[PDB]
Amino acid sequence: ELATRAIPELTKLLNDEDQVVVNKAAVMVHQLSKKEASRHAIMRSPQMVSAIVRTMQNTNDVETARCTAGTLHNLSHHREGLLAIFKSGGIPALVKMLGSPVDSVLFYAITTLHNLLLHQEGAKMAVRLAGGLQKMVALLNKTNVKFLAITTDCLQILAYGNQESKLIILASGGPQALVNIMRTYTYEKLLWTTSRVLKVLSVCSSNKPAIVEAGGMQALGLHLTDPSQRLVQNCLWTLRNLSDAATKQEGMEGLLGTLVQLLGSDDINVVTCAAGILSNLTCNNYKNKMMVCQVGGIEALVRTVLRAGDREDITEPAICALRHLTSRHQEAEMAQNAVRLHYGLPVVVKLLHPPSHWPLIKATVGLIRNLALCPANHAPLREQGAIPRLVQLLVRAHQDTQFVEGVRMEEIVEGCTGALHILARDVHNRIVIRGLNTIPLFVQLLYSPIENIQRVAAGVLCELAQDKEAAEAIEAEGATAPLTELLHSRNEGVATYAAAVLFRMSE
């Protein structure tokens, strides 16, 4: 046990006022930290560790700083050494050394801090408290990509499930620098570790705009075709989180093209994510809607729904995307036809039936409603058996409302009746709708407090009332009084159809 008088005396030498003495101690201690036997003897001596920590941060001798930092680094490979570093106030010192202009000292500091963050308890809160986050974010402008990979992983460990840390990164200009890493470098580890930080940051809603405004959507989209599976996946997850706040963000065309390509991926998780992002990005943005249509997005989304089967995780976002693409833009009509031309109508109608759950059904009804606007879809939708199921769904939804799975039954009623309203433009469809004994139900919907349900219920009744016999059955059901009431609505749409039904009942 040579450490009986070797360690204590060496501790004193490090504590000496003469720099040259301290320097000689530092180099020796540093060598002692390279062997299991002698390194253990340093770990068992807090006084020694304290001396190293103090020297490292206080010294103006670069070799000493290097040797003291390297010693701590060597200790950090073991449980005992990590705990020794922790308890001797190593972390604040290590954080301080992140300002070092010496690369070796800086690299020892980050590596040691990384090890502490990975393996030592209390290390995260200690680093946070010592102002580590600000430091680490300011270091993201360094050019060594291996250094950046370690730094970004430290941030990930700090930020994960910690609002304090996330907000500090946001405050310190973290998104800007992180997004810059993703647009500049090609080192896979760095891109990977950076993506996981941006993912953590992308979770909270208030945090998303900073990543978006910096150009994060495009920077993330840049790596979607990269060989790395883990990189692509993290980019996709982040993009999907962000895409809720990037619905009005401009310049998304390149990304959208790639997302449509990704729908043809062998990896189902890739397809699911791509569909989800496309769903988000196409919502209330005509440029995004148009772009997706131009690159054959309809075919891809139809084929995705077909390929998905009863996987509602995939069909729901795919159907939603299609619903977005079939309304309120220049190529909505092209899109409505495309769904038919690419053999979508069979599967779209199929999804109305069980075992589909309400969120999907709601989206599917909305899509069918849009598809019905195209006259060429009237007969195919009928021939696929859309009318009976639409009625059946309307009936079940009406019973409750005379939230299920997070879906209002009022929205199902409105959506089903709205679809039937559009379908009832076709004479053959009107025959089917009448044949299902829908007149009494539609008249009851005139009593609804919701104006949109009143409009579509009167709307469908209007269409049906074209036939004289149907008009008699509507009058016979006692629609006149509700209609007369609805004639005075401030909602012009409701009042228009109310007047129309009364008129057709009178001729």
Place this chain on the structure above:
Amino acid sequence: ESILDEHLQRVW
């Protein structure tokens, strides 16, 4: 630079 390389090999 070997500081970083050796660390990378430990962690990942």
